[PDB]
Design a protein around this ligand. Structure first.
Ligand SMILES: CCCCCCCCCCCCCCCCCC(=O)OC[C@H](COP(=O)([O-])OCC(O)COP(=O)([O-])OC[C@@H](COC(=O)CCCCCCCCCCCCCCCCC)OC(=O)CCCCCCCCCCCCCCCCC)OC(=O)CCCCCCCCCCCCCCCCC
Ligand SMILES: COC1=C(OC)C(=O)C(C/C=C(/C)CC/C=C(/C)CC/C=C(/C)CC/C=C(\C)CC/C=C(\C)CC/C=C(\C)CC/C=C(/C)CC/C=C(/C)CC/C=C(/C)CCC=C(C)C)=C(C)C1=O
Ligand SMILES: CCCCCCCCCCCCCCCCC[C@@H](O)O[C@H](CO[C@H](O)CCCCCCCCCCCCCCC)COP(=O)(O)OCC[N+](C)(C)C
Ligand SMILES: CCCCCCCC/C=C\CCCCCCCC(=O)O[C@H](COC(=O)CCCCCCC/C=C/CCCCCCCC)COP(=O)(O)OCCN
Ligand SMILES: NC(=O)C1=CN([C@@H]2O[C@H](COP(=O)(O)OP(=O)(O)OC[C@H]3O[C@@H](n4cnc5c(N)ncnc54)[C@H](OP(=O)(O)O)[C@@H]3O)[C@@H](O)[C@H]2O)C=CC1
Ligand SMILES: CCCCCCCCCCC1=C(C)C(=O)C(OC)=C(OC)C1=O
Ligand code: SF4
Ligand code: SF4
Ligand code: SF4
Ligand SMILES: [Zn+2]
Lengths: 115, 96, 144, 342, 63, 156, 176, 208
């Protein structure tokens, strides 16, 4: 039985429905975020970034973890809509000042000791 | 006891001077390199060895509570002088 | 009692070595008070005292016009005070270094230096320790 | 490799990159980006400056403690150059005016100074020298700018045979004199273009692309004695480029044709300013010269850089030139200009 | 009323840790050895978790 | 030369005007701002030197970073620094602003305000005394006295 | 035990009502405030003429750090690293080795003055009175790097301020 | 004993023990343990389901009248199956007494919000969520209170690094403040201070 108390959803289907609602809200919000923050990116870039952030956690199978992720996403959206975030916070999702770190074995061997 | 390296950089009391091919020298260009000129080893080397008439002597560095913790130094060996582990002063028993 | 304050102002004017001295102390320190001289530095600073002033104005220094290397007729700062007169001036003690000279030591600086930031004499930090890892030196001769 | 000059760390602010670079002309447009890219990865940067130290404050937060050093220098004095290049393994030359002053003409800043820097760096033991030239540099050019650039690169190659020469083409950025210059033309009502800009082709390049190309050329062992051309991905007719510039800034575009002699006279008239001229006859020539095509030279793609199109970075420069009513307009609103791609 | 989940516990997505410091780290679980310089054994009672040692380098300033 | 003398005298006049009227922004962050207030107090009376607090960044000449700069606060400090018209100066006061100080290893603290804005004068202490801050301000005045903008322009 | 602050009633007699009406129409308390400000106008101000006059300090005052010497010139520091351990901000970095004559001395002794909180814990922990906080507070710099003191800087500070430091310690060592 | 040793107060000890017995008798459904410390502080351990009934009883009962919520915080103990210890500190002005109510939760089990009992609990619960990640159900407005916007992780957890994962600086190319992975010029120096000899025999644990 595992006797666990839920947060919002009884199983994975209601968690998926909440995920879809949050995705809809973010998708609607993206153009307004682009206009209000005076971002140099396009709406397509913002929606692709939202999709990337959603797919980052695609492997989650625990409904409680999905509910907490949806709660955090709603907190982030509420921060973005109310302009509590600034342009720096929005652009932190893009990592525009970090150099692209290579993935292949030889490049890591050349640069240093990190695996 | 300051000394200059073959490059002209003053060698500090700790003996560190940049290698002629060391890029870190550039920090001293248009500026100076801070070096203390009072080398403590030479200063303590100038102090005379105190003659005392006992096998054990006490040293607190002078000034009472303004010195260092008081230690007792054995002086049985005539081959070498008794040095304070805190202050560096030297003591010995009368010989010759 | 108006004539009294006017005469005290005239006495302040006459007590600074004349009108030129009065304007010198007026434009160099924005203060024209006359006090009892306590002593003088080896660098030229003059120290005065007036116990009738309230705590904070009873001690003051008239800075020299030429310290170690620079002209200080206008460019003065609080770092030009030597340590003994620093102790007297900040009221850490009631005794000037004239009646109570400091303890002489062979390692104490004989010449005080002011804040040298922004000058070629500024302190530049550097590591004071030796190189830790020694590299192997290959032989200088051929191997066949 | 002089153990103190062995790379260490993760590649960030507190890391060691193994590069000790003296960056001449680091207080200008390209210089700040070059110093920023050097300082991101933990390089030691030497900034020789002739201006007032207040004009170098923006470069200070670009490096960790001790990683950026400022020393005065004089272009007409070789002792200053040797002083600032004694301990460096890389020397970058970004010195250049777009106008001639009473103390420094084009030959002084593009021929004499680069040659002196190259000779001093060679005799001082510097291993790598990066010299910046122009794509349109030509000994038979109607511009004294480009003739001086050609003579300067010839003499730099003569004095430092292992130097790397980079030839960018009309770099555009936030602090440029290319988009801002065209944007600035709205004040005079109409935009004077020679032949209506229909006989000029431009290939502008992004500032970050050029700075990253310089950084990668420093780290590339094959780029030692080569010559590179840094150009953008697209070629535009000058008329269409200026029209797109005005469209992005949401300003009314009123182009009219002006004869070459008259607009040269206008440039000469503007040249009399004791301050920075608004335009010069040399600028008159260079704006209306087509960008050369040099397919025999390696480009940004040979240094691992994909050229950034102007249509992606024009808004970050031209949004400042809009009025209040169009400030919030998005980037994908302004219908990118037609490109003459061969 | 409870939901009866049946999967092993995983909270990696909620800790805010970068991906590098989850999949490339190796933690050692052990009881620390007694410091041989002393005879006290009070420091060998609990279990410790520590990460794998990474690179340390000299700062160009101050060393 | 005549022009050299003229530009030197003009530099002297402009530098005197700028260092004799220094208006810091009404801007403080933590414990250090208390010592800033005490340096504004009647004992030291910065107003007698010509130093007046003004709330608007548009009307301020100096920013005194007096207190810890956190990550949440850094964008606001950068914003108010940027809005300052030039010439502008920044004075860093206290260990927290100089290098992070006693919260240097914290996850939410910027390790020195020089990562965000260029700094002209560093005032050490935790907190620096009001007298130490006055010394730092007078040092900033002396540094402003050494500017040679018009000489540099003339020699260009 | 307690008291009330705003529990007094005004008397309703014609005298008091007329006095309150005169207060309302003629602004008497405003004139009282003006009189207090005028009284302060003619008082002597509390301003001192810095830098010619200085604020009073104590022998216990904690200023710039310095490294002291024995009267023979020998360094007092013995590299015991108590100050490094106790330092609440981890501002002290110490390395040591036996000297050429076998003495226990430091080779690195750095104080990050931008990490320091000037608490004086280090001079309390020192068993030989080697590290102290001096009386100097006017050492502002123009660059961050100048506030990273190494052993040479601290030894120079000691050599430069020993005359005042010894006198300050002499006045307070019986309270320690 | 005398000059250097803290004196005892047996009267308060017995009073607090009696009131703890009283509370445990009135609420057997939720109370698991009652403790009185030797410096006279009363602690009541409850099941997580009893957060609202126990606090309501302590606030509204005539003999309790704990009308003031002094503090609400969390403690992270990674070795426990239930990671987070939730501590309530209450003050009674009618009886000049203080009480502590303690419960537990893990990373995924929500705790009931106490804003209906104490209005003060709003920001305390917000801070607990921000610092530890404990979700409070039915909280009127739950969001970060202390951390930066978009901050990832919960810093007060024992496994969160002291210096975090990202640091801030101003970047001139993008003309804004950016966040990058932390690099420290000097690494924080870990000190091993614990003595290998036992200090307090009164707290010695069985050797298992
Ligand atoms: C307008 C009326 C001015 C009359 C006047 O100045 O007398 C004020 C004089 C001030 O007395 P006080 O400041 O209470 O006395 C303190 C000592 O005399 C403190 O005296 P002191 O030792 O500071 O004296 C320094 C001296 C020198 O001070 C200066 O020269 C600097 C200021 C010059 C101002 C001109 O000041 C003067 O004597 C000149 C006073 C103003 C001259 C004008 O008394 C009056 O005349 C009161 C007049 C009614 C005022 C309402
Ligand atoms: C990017 O660089 C540049 C600058 O730097 C930031 C400039 O200031 C600059 C010049 C600045 C303009 C705003 C000048 C505008 C003033 C004009 C002269 C007005 C036009 C004529 C007036 C006198 C109005 C009267 C009309 C006629 C009757 C004459 C230019 C062009 C420039 O390109
Ligand atoms: C007429 C309308 C148009 C012109 C508008 C301007 C009006 C004229 C400007 C008024 C000039 C007055 C300024 C002079 C005050 C200097 C005071 C003196 O102290 O300066 C010293 C030396 O002087 C300065 O070096 C230079 C000041 C003079 C500048 C040169 C004169 C230029 C005049 C040219 C007029 C042209 C105006 C523009 C015409 C279009 C430096 O000392 P300082 O460090 O401070 O004080 C130390 C503080 N202590 C004493 C407490 C320790
Ligand atoms: C025989 C026939 C005679 C004919 C009639 C003549 C007799 C007249 C007698 C009455 C005259 C009274 C005149 C005063 C007018 C206004 C008084 C007043 O009541 O105003 C105050 C408010 O006025 C103020 O307090 C002023 C506020 C601003 C203060 C600014 C500084 C104060 C002034 C400094 C000194 C004034 C000097 C003025 C003259 C300068 C010389 C030109 C009321 O406000 P409250 O107390 O809140 O009551 C409201 C609800 N009941
Ligand atoms: N910008 C473009 O579109 C293109 C640029 N280039 C080349 O790139 C280089 C720099 O580009 P950019 O940064 O835009 O040019 P900037 O004018 O923006 O930078 C100029 C730099 O050169 C220095 N300098 C100029 N003349 C002298 C001198 N006589 N003595 C000493 N220093 C001097 C300036 O110092 P101070 O600030 O004191 O004047 C400044 O640091 C130039 O060589 C330019 O020709 C090549 C192709 C196109
Ligand atoms: C006019 C009186 C002098 C005011 C000096 C300006 C103070 C600027 C610091 C801002 C600040 C204020 C106003 C302040 O009131 C305060 O206490 C809550 C602070 O905490 C330290 C502050 O940082
Ligand atoms: S430096 Fe010290 S006094 Fe100033 S804000 Fe930081 S902790 Fe407070
Ligand atoms: S005063 Fe305190 S913070 Fe400063 S070095 Fe000494 S112990 Fe460390
Ligand atoms: S300064 Fe004092 S406490 Fe610090 S290492 Fe030296 S002797 Fe020990
Ligand atoms: Zn001794």
């Amino acid at each position: 039985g595992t006797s666990v108390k839920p947060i919002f959803s009884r199983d994975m289907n209601e968690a998926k429905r909440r995920v879809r609602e949050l995705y809809r809200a973010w998708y609607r919000e993206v153009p307004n975020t682009v206009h209000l923050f005076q971002l140099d990116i396009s709406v397509k870039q913002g929606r692709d970034k939202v999709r990337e952030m959603f797919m980052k956690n695609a492997h989650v199978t625990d409904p409680r973890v999905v509910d907490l992720l949806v709660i955090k996403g709603k907190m982030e959206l509420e921060e973005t809509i109310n302009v509590w975030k600034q342009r720096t916070h929005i652009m932190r999702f893009f990592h525009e000042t970090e150099a692209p770190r290579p993935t292949d074995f030889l490049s890591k061997f050349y640069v240093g000791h990190d695996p | 006891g300051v000394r200059t390296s073959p490059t002209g950089e003053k060698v500090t009391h700790t003996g560190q001077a940049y290698d002629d091919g060391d890029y870190r020298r550039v920090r001293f260009s248009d500026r100076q390199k801070e070096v203390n000129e009072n080398f403590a080893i030479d200063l303590i080397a100038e102090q005379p060895v105190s003659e005392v008439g006992s096998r054990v002597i006490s040293c607190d560095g002078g000034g009472g509570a303004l010195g260092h913790p008081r230690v007792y130094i054995n002086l049985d060996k005539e081959t070498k002088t008794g040095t304070c582990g805190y202050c560096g002063l030297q003591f010995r028993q009368p010989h010759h | 009692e108006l004539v009294q304050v006017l005469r005290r102002g005239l006495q302040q004017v006459s007590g600074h070595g004349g009108l030129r001295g009065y304007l010198r102390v007026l434009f160099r320190a924005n203060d024209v008070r006359v006090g009892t001289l306590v002593g003088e530095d080896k660098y030229g600073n003059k120290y005065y005292e007036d116990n009738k002033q309230f705590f904070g104005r009873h001690r003051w220094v008239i800075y020299t016009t030429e310290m170690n290397g620079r002209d200080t007729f206008w460019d003065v700062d609080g770092s030009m005070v030597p340590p003994e007169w620093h102790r007297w001036l900040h009221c850490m003690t009631d005794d000037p270094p004239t009646t109570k000279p400091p303890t002489a030591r062979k390692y104490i600086w004989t010449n005080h230096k002011f804040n040298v930031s922004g000058t070629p004499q500024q302190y530049v930090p550097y590591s004071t320790t030796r190189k830790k890892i020694q590299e192997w030196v290959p032989p200088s001769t051929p191997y066949k | 490799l002089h153990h103190a000059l062995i790379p260490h760390g993760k590649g960030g602010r507190s890391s060691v990159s193994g590069i000790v670079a003296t960056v001449f002309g680091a207080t200008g447009f390209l210089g700040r980006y070059v110093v920023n890219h050097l300082g991101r990865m933990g390089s030691q940067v030497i900034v020789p400056y002739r201006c007032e130290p207040y004009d170098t404050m923006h470069l200070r937060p670009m490096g960790d403690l001790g990683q950026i050093i400022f020393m005065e220098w004089n272009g007409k004095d070789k002792d200053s150059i040797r002083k600032v290049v004694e301990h460096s393994n890389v020397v970058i030359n970004l010195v250049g005016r777009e106008w001639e002053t009473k103390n420094f003409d084009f030959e002084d800043v593009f021929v004499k100074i680069p040659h002196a820097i190259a000779q001093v760096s060679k005799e001082a033991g510097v291993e790598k020298l990066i010299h910046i030239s122009h794509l349109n540099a030509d000994i038979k050019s109607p511009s004294r700018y480009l003739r001086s650039k050609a003579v300067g690169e010839k003499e730099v190659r003569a004095a430092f045979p292992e130097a790397t020469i980079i030839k960018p083409s009309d770099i555009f950025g936030r602090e440029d004199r290319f988009l801002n210059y065209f944007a600035s033309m709205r004040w005079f009502g109409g935009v004077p273009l020679i032949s209506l800009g229909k006989e000029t082709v431009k290939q502008p390049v992004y500032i970050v692309d050029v700075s990253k190309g310089i950084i990668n050329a420093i780290k590339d062992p094959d780029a030692k004695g080569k010559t590179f051309a840094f150009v953008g991905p697209n070629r535009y007719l000058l008329f269409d480029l200026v029209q797109y510039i005005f469209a992005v800034a949401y300003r009314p575009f009123l182009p009219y044709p002006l004869p070459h002699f008259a607009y040269r006279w206008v440039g000469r008239l503007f040249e009399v300013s004791p301050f920075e001229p608004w335009t010069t006859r040399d600028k008159v020539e260079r704006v209306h010269m087509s960008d050369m095509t040099l397919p025999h030279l390696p480009g940004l793609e040979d240094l691992g850089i994909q050229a950034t199109p102007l249509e992606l970075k024009a808004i970050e420069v031209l949004r400042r030139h809009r009025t209040y009513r169009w400030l919030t307009s998005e980037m994908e609103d302004v219908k990118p200009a037609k490109t003459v791609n061969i | 009323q409870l939901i009866a989940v049946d999967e092993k516990l995983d909270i990696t997505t909620l800790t805010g840790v970068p991906e590098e410091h989850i999949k490339t780290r190796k933690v050692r679980i052990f009881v620390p050895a007694r410091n041989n310089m002393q005879s006290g054994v009070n420091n060998t009672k609990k279990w410790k978790m520590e990460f794998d040692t990474r690179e340390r380098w000299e700062n160009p300033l101050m060393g | 030369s005549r022009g050299e003398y003229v530009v030197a005298k003009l530099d002297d006049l402009v530098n005197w005007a700028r260092r004799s009227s220094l208006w810091p922004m009404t801007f403080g962050l933590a414990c250090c701002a208390v010592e800033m207030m005490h340096m504004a107090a009647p004992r030291y009376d910065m107003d007698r030197f010509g130093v007046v607090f003004r709330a608007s960044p548009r009307q301020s000449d100096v920013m005194i970073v007096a207190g810890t700069l956190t990550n949440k606060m850094a964008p606001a400090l950068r914003k108010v620094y940027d809005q300052m018209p030039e010439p502008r100066y920044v004075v860093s006061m206290g260990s927290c602003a100089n290098g992070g100080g006693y919260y240097h290893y914290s996850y939410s603290v910027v390790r020195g305000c020089d990562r965000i804005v260029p700094v002209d004068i560093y005032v050490p202490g935790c907190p620096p005394t009001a007298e130490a801050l006055l010394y730092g301000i007078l040092q900033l005045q002396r540094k402003i006295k050494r500017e040679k903008r018009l000489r540099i322009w003339y020699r260009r | 035990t307690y008291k009330f602050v705003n529990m007094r009633e005004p008397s309703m007699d014609m005298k008091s009502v007329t006095d309150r009406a005169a207060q309302t129409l003629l602004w008497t308390e405003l004139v009282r405030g003006l009189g207090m400000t005028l009284s302060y106008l003619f008082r002597e101000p509390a301003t001192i003429n810095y830098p010619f006059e200085k604020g009073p300090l104590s022998p216990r005052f904690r200023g710039e750090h310095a490294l002291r010497r024995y009267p023979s010139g020998e360094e007092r520091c013995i590299a015991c690293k108590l100050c490094e351990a106790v330092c609440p901000a981890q501002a002290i970095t110490i390395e040591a080795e036996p000297r050429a004559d076998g003495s226990r001395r430091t080779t690195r002794y750095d104080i990050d003055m931008t990490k320091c909180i000037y608490c004086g814990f280090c001079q309390e922990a020192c068993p030989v009175d080697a590290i102290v906080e001096g009386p100097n507070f006017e050492f502002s710099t123009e660059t961050h790097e100048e506030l990273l003191y190494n052993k040479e800087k601290l030894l120079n500070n000691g050599d430069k301020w020993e005359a005042e430091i010894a006198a300050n310690i002499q006045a307070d060592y019986l309270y320690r | 004993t005398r000059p250097t040793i803290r004196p005892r107060n047996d009267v308060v000890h017995k009073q607090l023990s009696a009131f703890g017995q009283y509370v445990a008798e009135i609420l057997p459904k939720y109370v698991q343990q009652v403790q009185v410390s030797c410096f006279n502080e009363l602690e009541i351990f409850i099941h997580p389901d009893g957060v609202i009934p126990v606090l309501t009883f302590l606030r509204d009962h005539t003999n309790a009248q704990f009308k003031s919520l002094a503090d609400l915080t969390a403690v992270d103990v990674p070795t426990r199956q239930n990671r987070f210890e939730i501590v309530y500190n209450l003050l009674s002005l009618r009886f000049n007494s203080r009480i502590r109510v303690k419960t537990y939760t893990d990373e995924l089990t929500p705790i009931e919000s106490s804003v209906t009992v104490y209005k003060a609990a709003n920001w305390y619960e917000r801070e607990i969520w921000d610092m530890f990640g404990v979700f409070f159900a039915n909280h009127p407005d739950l969001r970060r209170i202390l951390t930066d916007y978009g901050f990832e992780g919960h810093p007060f957890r024992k496994d969160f690094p002291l210096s975090g994962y990202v640091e801030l600086r101003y970047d001139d190319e993008v003309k804004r403040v950016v966040a990058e992975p932390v690099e420290l010029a000097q690494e924080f120096r870990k000190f091993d201070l614990n003595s290998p000899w036992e200090a307090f025999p009164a707290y010695r644990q069985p050797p298992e």
